[PDB]
Amino acid sequence: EIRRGRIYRDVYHKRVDEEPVDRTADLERARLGDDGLDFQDDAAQARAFAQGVFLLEIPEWLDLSAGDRFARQFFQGTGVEPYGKYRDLSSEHFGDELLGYHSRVDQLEQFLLERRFWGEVYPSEIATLGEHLTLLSHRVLRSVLASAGIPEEDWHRASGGCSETNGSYHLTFNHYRSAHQDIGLSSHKDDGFITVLRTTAQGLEVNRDDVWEKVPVDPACFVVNFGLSMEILTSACVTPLSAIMHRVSHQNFDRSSFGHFSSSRCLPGADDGIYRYLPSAGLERVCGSRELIEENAHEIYMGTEGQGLEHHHHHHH
Numbered sequence: 187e188i189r190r191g192r193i194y195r196d197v198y199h200k201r202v203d204e205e206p207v208d209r210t211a212d213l214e215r216a217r218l219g220d221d222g223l224d225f226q227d228d229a230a231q232a233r234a235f236a237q238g239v240f241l242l243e244i245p246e247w248l249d250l251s252a253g254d255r256f257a258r259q260f261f262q263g264t265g266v267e268p269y270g271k272y273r274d275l276s277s278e279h280f281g282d283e284l285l286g287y288h289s290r291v292d293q294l295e296q297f298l299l300e301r302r303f304w305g306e307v308y309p310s311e312i313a314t315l316g317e318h319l320t321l322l323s324h325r326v327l328r329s330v331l332a333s334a335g336i337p338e339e340d341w342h343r344a345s346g347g348c349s350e351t352n353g354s355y356h357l358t359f360n361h362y363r364s365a366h367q368d369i370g371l372s373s374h375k376d377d378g379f380i381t382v383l384r385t386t387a388q389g390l391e392v393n394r395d396d397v398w399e400k401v402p403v404d405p406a407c408f409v410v411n412f413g414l415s416m417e418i419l420t421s422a423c424v425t426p427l428s429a430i431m432h433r434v435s436h437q438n439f440d441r442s443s444f445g446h447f448s449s450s451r452c453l454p455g456a457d458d459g460i461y462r463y464l465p466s467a468g469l470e471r472v473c474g475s476r477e478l479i480e481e482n483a484h485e486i487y488m489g490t491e492g493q494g495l496e497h498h499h500h501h502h503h
């Protein structure tokens with residue numbers, strides 16, 4: 187089901203759509219307060235889950251200031267205190283090729299770290315931020331699973347442990363180098379179940395249906411994305427949920443962001459796998475969790491195979 191360079195062939199037309207973006211997306215808005223996850227009404231929640239993206243009000247108790255500073259500093263090198271030294275931590279420090287500082291082939295450079303290292307490696311205030319976002323993400327995920335009609339007995343296996351905060355969690359910081367040419371971050375779907383994105387400036391674009399649209403800047407809200415694992419899991423339920431195709435436009439001045447990603451456990455020696463739920467037969471394994479992550483990473487930055495799909499390029503008409 188997961189073939190290298192072919193994950194996105196069914197949305198290839200979205201990946202090569204480079205028409206100017208003049209629309210802004212009207213996303214549904216939810217809150218997670220004293221009543222759980224709360225949209226304006228049931229219709230709004232259904233629209234949000236079918237689009238695979240919505241806005242989530244940042245709880246008043248949650249402190250993001252250290253994350254915002256880390257996102258603006260991690261890449262600067264050991265000269266710059268307190269966070270510039272994270273530039274120098276590469277994957278061999280963690281025994282995990284996914285983690286540490288990464289200079290991508292798009293404008294973005296990243297620092298990515300999985301939860302098993304937060305307490306040891308991140309500044310304590312950043313580890314605290316990661317744990318708070320994990321508990322917040324956990325509550326969102328359980329609301330979504332409850333609406334999908336999957337029996338609760340199956341949630342732990344269906345979520346690779348995320349239904350009980352036993353999945354894999356990455357707290358990832360993004361810096362868009364405006365001196366680099368071309369797209370800020372290529373169009374993609376995230377690997378996992380739930381992504382919680384903290385953005386404070388223009389750049390994020392989503393393609394919920396047939397057109398790319400700008401996500402409005404609202405620093406009092408998170409953007410919540412569903413990822414490929416959520417799409418795969420619910421693909422045969424009564425109401426399949428979409429993973430949102432999204433990208434970051436070319437940045438003319440530097441931009442920073444960070445995100446919390448929930449995935450099926452993908453430890454190098456303990457991989458919980460990716461499943462789809464069949465209303466008849468139950469859970470069926472589709473692929474490995476790390477397998478999905480690395481084939482996704484390949485195709486996000488190296489591109490989707492386009493043979494036979496050339497009519498989707500505007501210049502061929």
Ligand SMILES: C[C@@H](CCO)[C@@H]1NC(=O)[C@H](C[C@@](C)(O)CO)NC1=O
Binds near residue numbers: 358
């Ligand atoms: C699991 C981990 C990705 C590990 O490679 C998690 N999952 C994602 O899909 C994104 C994807 C891209 C845009 O960020 C990375 O370049 N980032 C994450 O941190």
Ligand SMILES: O=C(O)CCC(=O)C(=O)O
Binds near residue numbers: 358371383433442443
């Ligand atoms: O920087 C952003 O707004 C988007 C980040 C993102 O989509 C990702 O890292 O997966």
Ligand SMILES: [Fe+2]
Binds near residue numbers: 374376
């Ligand atoms: Fe993403």
